[PDB]
Write a protein that binds this DNA or RNA. Structure first.
Lengths: 63, 132, 378
RNA sequence: CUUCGAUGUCGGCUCUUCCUACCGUCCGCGCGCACCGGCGCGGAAGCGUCGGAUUGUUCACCCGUUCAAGGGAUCGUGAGCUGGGUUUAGACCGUCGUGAGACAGGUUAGUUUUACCCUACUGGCCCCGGGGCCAGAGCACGGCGGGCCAGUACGAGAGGAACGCCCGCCGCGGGCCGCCAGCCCCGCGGUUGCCCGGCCGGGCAGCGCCGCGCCGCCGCGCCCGGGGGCCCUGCGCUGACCGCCUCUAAGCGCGCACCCCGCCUCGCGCCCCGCCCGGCCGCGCGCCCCAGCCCCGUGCCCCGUCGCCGAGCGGCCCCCGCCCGGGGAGACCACCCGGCGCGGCGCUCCUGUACGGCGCAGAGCCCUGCGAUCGCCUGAGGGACGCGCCUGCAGAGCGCGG
RNA sequence: GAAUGGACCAACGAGGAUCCCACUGUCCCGAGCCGCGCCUCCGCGAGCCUCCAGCCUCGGGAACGGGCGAGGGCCGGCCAGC
RNA sequence: GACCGCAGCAGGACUCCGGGGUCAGCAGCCUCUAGCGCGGGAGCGAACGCGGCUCAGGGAAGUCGGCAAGCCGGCUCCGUAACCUCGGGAAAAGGAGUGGCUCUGACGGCCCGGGUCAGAACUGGAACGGACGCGGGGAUCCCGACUGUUUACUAGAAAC
């Protein structure tokens, strides 16, 4: 199906699941889960949470 | 214009919404919503794309304040569900001052504007930079 | 004096008395209009709620903003283990009202149906239809009784039993329903059609078609003794009130001297027979097919089972019917589906672009175990 | 006229019913009604009559909006509440009194007693099969816009309809949890003080605090809500009395958001079937019509008073367990299901990478020592009340009643 | 209205008003969740009240009846609420 | 723990001795010593109460009144207005920092002591008064200058 990924988590949001935030910079931020969103709204870094593909990239575990 | 699908109403009366247009008003206080029948004890409610009767806050230019003005809410902080299943929310709650005829009182609409607001009001749609 | 500000009553008095349903399962009560001119069709079928899901759909509703546009809706899967007919009941239309004119039972009644007859099968003496089996078996007696129905009956019904072995629940005893036979040119044809279905399985696919709308009947989810604020919808009074704010304040005037039945009072909320109506049948298929719920866009086999199993329900091994939105009742509860009595005229046509087999247990992102295995790989 | 060995007193909040002397919506009808809009009637009480600023306000008034009638219920509604008003004892001020004191003048501070009874109401119970059926009782969809129609009828223009269909929406109602919010029973991670010698792993601070969080419940989310019958006011039809005329006096058609039924919520009882299939009772049928009444005006007249055979119809009676364990169910019960459960293993999900070992990581310091941390083994480990299975123990009372 | 004291407010004040920023279930509009009661059991066990009796509608009556006149409902025995 | 209130009455009774840690603390929060397990227990986990938490978006629109709750708060360092009886206002308002580790300076006595105050690095999901303790703030108006006192048991006041 048509699929989008979390702007933070980088996991494919399945159709009908997730919340999209329109930032004041006119950028849509698609979020898979409430956890994906809460981490972003606390500005906690994506690259210090291991489950995120960003940290998977930094470890070079998944890139 | 057209028929508006119901969206969750996130801004009750007494809400203060930002101005998204260069009219010279900074903060708009929602006095009421157009087309509201009431139930005992129920404050009027409003959502993206709905005309709201607002008053300009003291921060606004003197000419704008001390009079009721019509406006359309274009951004809502509360998340709402579109028929396709998309749940969308905005960083801030904002509105643009517009006559019921549909003439904007402002040259430009700054920031993102909701698709629902843009379809219902034609002038907002051309002016808005982005319709996310 | 007067209420001063006009406010409506809270609650439907039609749904009073709000008591736990004494009838065991949701009963069909009234059945669809006979018509007297259609291929003979059974009008109902029992189901067990299996779960709910998301269905991507393409809308062809002309005149609506959704025309030529996609949508996602709540679906409700009703597990449908195939039912088997065990008897035929005929009803004369009498001045007093429809009254039975005798029923002819099957020569061989299945153990699930017999299990319904007893409270404890193991400790019972299994003495059910013992002399009946001897009276029939030859089957001459069954035909003679069926002939009595042909002359003395005007409304024909088929008794049917669900087999709960092919359903994840532990009911073990069968559920019996009188499914009406409607549409045949004449009563003699109706009972002839019934004899062909006797002691043989009926499947939802035969009873209901995709695109039709059905009325779902079941006992609602029970909340126990509830307060007036939850049960009837009243306001929680000002928080500066002594003795509580979760109570209707005044329950009547001086006169009438008695509390009226209108006034909201605290009691049992839940376990109420309710009939929902005109829920469109999105898809009828069997879970045995690996590609039963596949669509062109996903390109995966996609069986109806979510990853990890339906929640509070299980295998849904056999056929299933999917209804638009919701039906009354919790998961694992019998729900009688009946052909609509008043269908919605302007309903769109159902074309499902995608179905969700993502695990409903937790939040799912993978629609197959292989898909989740591929992501976690090493 | 009743009440003082006391019926708590104003207005609100909350909730429920009732009235029509009708504001809009519905149906006709008249205008000094072209359209639009107004206005006046008759029927009509289903639905709506809202959000707010001052005031204790009822009122009043003003602002908004789908533009917003008026009233009854011990001036509905205090073991329902509030105490704002009022209305005791404290205190000022103004006026009046020689004074104590007064005020139908203002100002502030000032306890809100008790239901366990009886009725009523709301649910729940008082052992008896499966399917059902219908007495009675409840009752529920209404309003508002848009798209067409059409800038068309209509009007000199300005303006400006409508039926029909199609879409929405708001209020209400009944559900539901797939999403998305909320929420966490003992899940995982962070962290502060203290204590268990430190590390690990814990406790205590009455869930120390925190960040997520499943099953479940929930609303802010979602599904759902299309109908018949007689008819009112009346509008018409054939048609008189009253050669005409005439909606009426017989006769006749249409017809209201009202009404009544349907669907729906309950349901005493009854029906059919099963296991059985046995007893008890009673003896009695034309039809229509009244301005043809087709031969009327009779008859029965004896349920014991001698009738009780049988057959035939029609009635009537007789049946139908718990405890116990779970749960989709629950105050208790009841309900629904039952050789359950316990605890494992897979699956899926929650949290976020376990202890420990390793490194030339590490700011530096100092001797091979120290070190908050960081990377790898590790999307790890830990947990689970959802699923699938038994691979282990088990699990169906000659317990009680019929 | 001028020591029946007048005007005057720095600083104070569990003194009496009005408004603003902030903040929040005060409210829209309620929802979930702990503990403890409640409920059920085991053991203990009162108080208060009490002509009698405890269903209604209307009528007449010390003008507002449970009882009286006329209807219309109603096995009896209990629980949790109210 | 036996007094006094009818009780083995969350009622009231005057002294004396007063350890450790966190701390400015005799505060709160845990503890050593010493005391000790209180007019009883089991279940269930309804409504409703009673205490306690959390709540999307809005925020007083609620109400007679922002009642109740929520905010704020420790320390250091900036930055502090009108007004004033020049003492105050003032903690005004309005901000910034705060943890752990690894160091480097200060400060005495005559190689021996203090553990407070600075200044760094480095590290951590964008965290640190991490519990606890602990002002929300401003603008006015009226009375009474003030600290005091007051109807034991419905007025704590502008009254005395």
């Amino acid at each position: 199906p048509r699929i989008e990924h979390c702007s933070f988590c980088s996991k494919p949001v399945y159709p009908g699941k997730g919340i999209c935030f329109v930032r004041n910079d006119s950028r849509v931020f698609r979020f898979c889960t409430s956890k994906c969103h809460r981490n972003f709204k606390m500005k906690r870094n994506p690259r210090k949470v291991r489950w995120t593909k960003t940290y998977r990239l930094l470890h070079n575990k998944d890139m | 214009i057209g028929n508006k699908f119901r969206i969750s109403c996130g801004l009750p009366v007494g809400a203060v919404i930002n101005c998204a247009d260069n009219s010279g008003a900074k903060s708009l206080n929602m006095i009421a919503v157009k087309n509201w029948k009431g139930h005992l004890n129920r404050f009027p409610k409003a959502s993206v794309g709905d005309m709201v009767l607002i008053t300009v806050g003291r921060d606004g230019k003197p000419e704008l304040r001390r009079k009721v003005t019509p406006a359309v809410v274009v951004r809502q902080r509360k998340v709402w569900r579109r028929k396709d299943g998309v749940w969308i929310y905005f960083q801030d709650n904002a509105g643009v001052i517009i006559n019921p005829k549909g003439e904007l009182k402002g040259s430009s609409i700054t920031g993102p504007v909701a698709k629902e607001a843009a379809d219902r009001w034609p002038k907002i749609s051309t002016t808005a930079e982005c319709v996310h | 004096s007067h209420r001063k500000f006009s406010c409506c009553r809270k609650g439907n008095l039609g749904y009073l008395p709000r008591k736990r349903c004494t009838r065991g399962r949701g009963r069909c009560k009234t059945f669809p209009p006979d018509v007297q001119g259609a291929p003979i069709h059974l009008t109902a079928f029992l189901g067990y709620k299996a779960g709910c899901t998301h269905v991507m759909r393409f809308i062809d509703h002309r005149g609506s903003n959704l025309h030529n546009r996609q949508a996602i809706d709540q679906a409700t899967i009703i597990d449908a283990p195939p039912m088997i007919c065990t008897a035929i009941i005929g009803y004369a239309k009498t001045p007093k009202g429809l009254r039975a004119v005798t029923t002819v039972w099957a020569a061989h009644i299945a153990e699930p149906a017999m299990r319904r007859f007893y409270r404890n099968y193991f400790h019972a003496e299994k003495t059910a239809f013992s002399t009946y089996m001897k009276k029939a078996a030859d089957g001459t007696y069954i035909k003679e009784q069926l002939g009595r129905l042909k002359q003395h009956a005007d409304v024909i019904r088929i008794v049917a039993h669900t087999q709960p072995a092919l359903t994840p629940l532990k009911q073990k005893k069968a559920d019996i329903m009188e499914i009406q036979v409607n549409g045949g040119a004449n009563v003699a044809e109706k009972v002839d059609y019934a004899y062909a279905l006797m002691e043989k399985p009926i499947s939802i696919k035969d009873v209901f078609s995709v695109g039709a709308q059905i009325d779902t009947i079941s006992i609602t989810r029970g909340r126990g003794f509830e307060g007036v604020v939850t049960r009837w919808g009243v306001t929680r009074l000002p928080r500066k009130t002594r003795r509580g704010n979760r109570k209707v304040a005044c329950i009547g005037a001086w006169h009438p001297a008695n509390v009226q039945y209108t006034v909201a009072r605290a009691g049992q909320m839940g376990y109420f027979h309710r009939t929902d109506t005109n829920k469109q049948v999105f898809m009828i298929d069997t879970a045995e097919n690996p590609r039963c719920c596949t669509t062109e866009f996903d390109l995966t086999d996609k069986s109806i089972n979510p990853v990890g199993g339906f929640v509070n329900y299980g295998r849904v091994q056999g056929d299933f019917i999917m209804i638009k939105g919701t039906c009354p009742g919790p998961k694992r509860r019998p729900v009688v589906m009946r052909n609509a009595l008043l269908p919605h005229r302007n309903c769109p046509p159902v074309q499902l672009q995608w179905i969700s087999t993502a695990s409903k247990f937790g939040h799912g992102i993978f629609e197959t175990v292989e898909e989740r295995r591929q992501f976690y790989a090493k």
